[PDB]
C-alpha cells in the first residue's frame, strides 16, 4: 500500500512512468501483484500525453492544452513543448524525475474488450499482473 | 547469620568523619509512650460508644523480620543504624566458621 502510494497509484487504472534502476525496480517488485506494467512504445507515450496528459500546477490537475503551460513549468529543465516532454520520457533523459512528477498520474479507462478471464494472477500464468513488456502497448491501447 | 560484635565503618559524627571502631548491638524497639499524639488521639477515639474505632491487623504473611544493627562509635558515642536482610537465624559474635574440620 505504501509502495503504491509512493508511485502515485492511488486508484484503479492509474498509470505512471518509472525509470528502471534498482531502487525503483525493487519498488515495482513489491507492488507487482497489484499492477500491470511493461515497456511503452513512442506512440503509446505520445497518445497518453496527448489525450490524458495533465500537469501539476500549484497542486492542481491542469490539462496540457498549450505549450506555454509546459514552458512555464519545465523551461528550467529545457522542456519547451509537448514533444520535448515526450522525448524526455521516451529516451530516459537527465530530467526524467521532474518531467514524470510534473505529469499527473494518468487516469485510464477500463479496456475496450475487457481483461483476461481473471486479472489478479501473473501475466505468465494467464492473468494480468506483472511484466508483459511489449503487450503493455496493447493494454494501454485498450485502456487509453 | 553470624555478625561480629565490632565493626569499622564510617562515622557520621561531626568530630570523626572517618572509619572508627563501633560496637554492634541488635536494635530493640523502645517502649510506647502514653503521651504520643497518635496514641493520645487513639485513646480519645476509642472512648465512649462505637466499639473499635481503628483497624486491627490479622492477615500476617511475613515469617521473619529485618534485623537492625545498632553501631555505637567508641570515640564519640554517636549511634548508627543498619538494617540487614530477612534472616530466620541470627547470632551476634558467634563461633566463627572452621573450614577443614571433620564430621
Amino acid at each position: 500500500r505504501k509502495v503504491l502510494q509512493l508511485l502515485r497509484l492511488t486508484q484503479i487504472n492509474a498509470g505512471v512512468f518509472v525509470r528502471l534502476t534498482k531502487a525503483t525496480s525493487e519498488l515495482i517488485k513489491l507492488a507487482e501483484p497489484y499492477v500491470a506494467y511493461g515497456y511503452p512504445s513512442l506512440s503509446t507515450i505520445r497518445q497518453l500525453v496527448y489525450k490524458r496528459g495533465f500537469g501539476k500546477v500549484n497542486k492542481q490537475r491542469i490539462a496540457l492544452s498549450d505549450n506555454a503551460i509546459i514552458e512555464a513549468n519545465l523551461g528550467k529543465f529545457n522542456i519547451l513543448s509537448i514533444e520535448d516532454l515526450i522525448h524526455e520520457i521516451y529516451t530516459v533523459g537527465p530530467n526524467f524525475k521532474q518531467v514524470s512528477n510534473f505529469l499527473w498520474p494518468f487516469k485510464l479507462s477500463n479496456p475496450n474488450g475487457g481483461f483476461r478471464a481473471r486479472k489478479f494472477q501473473h501475466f505468465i500464468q494467464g492473468g494480468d499482473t506483472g511484466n508483459r513488456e511489449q503487450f503493455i502497448n496493447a493494454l494501454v491501447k485498450q485502456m487509453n | 547469620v553470624n555478625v561480629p560484635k565490632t565493626r569499622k565503618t564510617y562515622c557520621k559524627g561531626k568530630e570523626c568523619r572517618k572509619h572508627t571502631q563501633h560496637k554492634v548491638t541488635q536494635y530493640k524497639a523502645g517502649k510506647a509512650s502514653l503521651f504520643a499524639q497518635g496514641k493520645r488521639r487513639y485513646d480519645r477515639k476509642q472512648s465512649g460508644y462505637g466499639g473499635q474505632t481503628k483497624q486491627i491487623f490479622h492477615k500476617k504473611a511475613k515469617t521473619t523480620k529485618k534485623v537492625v544493627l545498632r553501631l555505637e562509635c567508641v570515640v564519640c558515642k554517636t549511634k548508627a543504624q543498619l538494617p540487614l536482610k530477612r534472616c530466620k537465624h541470627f547470632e551476634l559474635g558467634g563461633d566463627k566458621k572452621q573450614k577443614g574440620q571433620a564430621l
Partner: protein, 159 residues
Amino acid sequence: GKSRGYRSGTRYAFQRDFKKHGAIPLSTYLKVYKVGDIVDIKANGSIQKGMPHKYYHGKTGIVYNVTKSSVGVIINKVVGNRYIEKRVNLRVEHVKHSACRQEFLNRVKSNAAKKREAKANGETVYLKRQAAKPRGSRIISTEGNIPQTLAPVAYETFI
C-alpha cells in the same frame, strides 16, 4: 506462572561465540571512545557489570558520556506511537565502533578529491551515487561457444 526477569530469553543472545569463550582480547580495552562516536552494542556474557539490557543487544547509538570504564550511549526506542530517548551506561566490553561511519567518511573524501581534480582540470564531475542501471547492448561471440541444446530430463528414481 509467568517469568519476565532481566535476562529472560537471552539463552543464546548472551552466549559466547563457539570456541571464543574466556579472556577478552585487549584491543577491546585499548579502543578510545569519544562523545559523538557511533557504536554497535553487543552484550558480552562474560562481563556482567555494565551489561546492556537484552533490548540494546544488536542496537547502534551515539556516545554521550565517557567514564572510567564505560560510555553512555543514546538510543531511540519505540514506545507506542513515538520514540523515547534512552541513555544506557555500558562498560566498553559490550561496545564496538560502528563500521557505517568509515564508508561514508571515505565517500566524503573521495567526493572532495574528485571535485578538486575536476576543478583543477577546469571540468565538471558528478558526485551523486546512482543505483544499478539496466545493462547496455552487447555482442556475444560464438567462436568456441556454439550453443548447446538442452532438454528437460525424464523422471528417474535413484534410491
